[PDB]
């Protein structure tokens with residue numbers, strides 16, 4: 001049989017449909033209803049836009065390349081596609097970091113939260129995030145600064161029917177540091193402090209109203225948030241660092257598999273973040 005030819009296509013199409021439907025529903029729900037327009041919901045809008053772009057562009061052409069085993073399009077479109085991939089991934093991760101910092105400021109400083117965050121300052125931050133995303137994905141790739149120098153890489157670059165990722169040590173390390181590790185450290189610190197604050201509040205409530213009946217929730221929420229992200233993206237950004245240092249340690253198929261596992265995070269974000277009752281009411285009004 002040829003269960004590989006037809007089997008993988010079904011799964012890839014399902015992934016594309018799930019990503020597109022979820023992100024479109026979130027975006028149109030925020031846009032149509034005036035109640036949902038909040039300074040917290042603009043970051044979710046940027047995240048959903050990045051996920052929608054990735055689902056429409058990065059995934060279908062990668063699936064076609066995998067199934068056909070050749071890059072039938074031009075040589076220019078290979079670099080265009082790589083640039084869009086890197087852009088979307090880094091923009092999404094930094095938007096997640098921005099949301100985490102927003103929550104940190106909301107709980108930690110209750111009185112001064114209103115002054116720090118304003119609709120004017122919630123746009124400058126998003127524009128800066130997207131600009132920083134664009135200055136690491138288009139500028140180095142299109143200027144041919146990431147290109148490797150060895151016989152297989154040179155032969156891949158010369159041929160017009162081969163689109164594979166070969167990169168330098170410097171670009172790999174700098175891209176990984178910019179895209180993954182700094183947001184990871186920021187999120188770890190932020191969520192640790194938020195957990196401390198929640199524990200202090202529970203202690204105070206128990207000490208005050210203990211005689212009447214009157215950390216499972218905090219643990220469950222933080223576990224979902226930080227386990228649907230580290231598990232999805234961490235394994236890839238270790239082999240990314242390793243594969244340049246050691247020539248034959250990491251195979252080429254494991255790289256692509258871990259990369260595609262990383263992409264799946266786009267279709268999960270509406271589930272993780274758009275769970276408020278207002279969002280459910282808006283979804284119920286739109287559909288059904």
Ligand SMILES: CN[C@@H]1CCc2c(ccc(O)c2O)[C@H]1O
Nearest residue numbers: 085086089090165175176179259
């Ligand atoms: C071909 N796929 C790319 C390869 C390297 C890379 C990705 C994402 C973010 C980065 O910072 C990267 O360096 C992947 O999406």
